A = this chain, B = another copy of it.
Amino acid sequence: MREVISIHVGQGGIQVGNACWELFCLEHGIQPDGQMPSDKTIGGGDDAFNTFFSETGAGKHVPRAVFLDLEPTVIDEVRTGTYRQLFHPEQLISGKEDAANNFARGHYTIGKEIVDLCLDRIRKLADNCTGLQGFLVFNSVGGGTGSGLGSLLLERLSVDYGKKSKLGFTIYPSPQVSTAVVEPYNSILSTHSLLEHTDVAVMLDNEAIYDICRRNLDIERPTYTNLNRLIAQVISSLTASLRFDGALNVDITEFQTNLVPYPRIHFMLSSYAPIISAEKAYHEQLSVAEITNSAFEPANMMAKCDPRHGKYMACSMMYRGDVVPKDVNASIATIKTKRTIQFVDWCPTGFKVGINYQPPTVVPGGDLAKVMRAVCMISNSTAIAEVFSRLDHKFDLMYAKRAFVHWYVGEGMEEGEFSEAREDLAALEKDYEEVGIETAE
Q: A residues engaging B (CB < 8 A)?
A: 34, 54-57, 60, 62, 85, 87-91, 124, 127-128, 218, 277, 279-280, 282-285, 287, 289-290, 293, 298-299, 306, 308-309, 339-340, 372, 414, 416, 420, 423, 427
Picked from B90, B287, B372, B416, the residue with its CB within 8 Å of the CB of A309 is B416
Q: Contacts A128-B287, A340-B423 given; 12 further ones with Cβ under 8 A?
A: A34-B282, A54-B285, A56-B284, A56-B285, A60-B282, A88-B279, A88-B282, A88-B283, A89-B218, A91-B283, A128-B290, A308-B420
Which residues of B have CB within 8 Å of A277? Answer: 89
A89 touches B280 (CB 8 A): yes
B420 touches A289 (CB 8 A): no
How many angstroms from the CA of A421 to the CA of B214 in the assembled complex?
27
Which residues of B have CB within 8 Å of A423? Answer: 340
Please name the residue on chain B nearest to A87 by beta carbon. Answer: B283
Which residues of B have CB within 8 Å of A289? Answer: 127
Q: How far is the CB of A323 from chain B (nearest CB, A)?
A: 15
A282 touches B56 (CB 8 A): yes
Please name the residue on chain B nearest to A306 by beta carbon. Answer: B416
How many angstroms from the CA of A427 to the CA of B339 in the assembled complex?
10
How many angstroms from the CA of A57 to the CA of B128 in the assembled complex?
45
Which residues of B have CB within 8 Å of A427? Answer: 339
Which residues of B have CB within 8 Å of A309? Answer: 282, 416
Given contacts A127-B293, A293-B127, A339-B427, contact A279 B89 (CB under 8 A): yes
- Identify the interface centre among A91, A306, A308, A414: most chain B CB within 10 Å of its CB: A308
Which residues of B have CB within 8 Å of A91? Answer: 283
B55 touches A285 (CB 8 A): yes
Which residues of B have CB within 8 Å of A60? Answer: 282-283
A298 touches B416 (CB 8 A): yes
A420 touches B287 (CB 8 A): no
A-B contact pairs, 11 of them (CB 8 A): A34-B282, A56-B282, A56-B285, A89-B277, A89-B280, A91-B283, A127-B289, A128-B285, A128-B290, A298-B414, A306-B416
A88 touches B128 (CB 8 A): no
Which residues of B have CB within 8 Å of A285? Answer: 54-57, 128
How many angstroms from the CA of A309 to the CA of B415 in the assembled complex?
11
B416 touches A280 (CB 8 A): no
Which residues of B have CB within 8 Å of A90? Answer: 280, 283-284
How many angstroms from the CA of A423 to the CA of B341 in the assembled complex?
12
Please name the residue on chain B nearest to A277 by beta carbon. Answer: B89
Q: How far is the CB of A99 from chain B (nearest CB, A)?
A: 21
A284 touches B88 (CB 8 A): yes
Which residues of B have CB within 8 Å of A127? Answer: 289-290, 293
B414 touches A299 (CB 8 A): yes
How many angstroms from the CA of A290 to the CA of B125 in the assembled complex?
10
- Identify the interface centre among A89, A282, A423: most chain B CB within 10 Å of its CB: A282
Q: How far is the CB of A325 from chain B (nearest CB, A)?
A: 21
How many angstroms from the CA of A299 to the CA of B120 in the assembled complex?
11
Q: How far is the CB of A36 from chain B (nearest CB, A)?
A: 15
- Identify the interface centre among A57, A89, A306, A414: most chain B CB within 10 Å of its CB: A89
How many angstroms from the CA of A298 to the CA of B116 in the assembled complex?
14
Which residues of B have CB within 8 Å of A308? Answer: 282, 416, 420
Which residues of B have CB within 8 Å of A280? Answer: 88-90
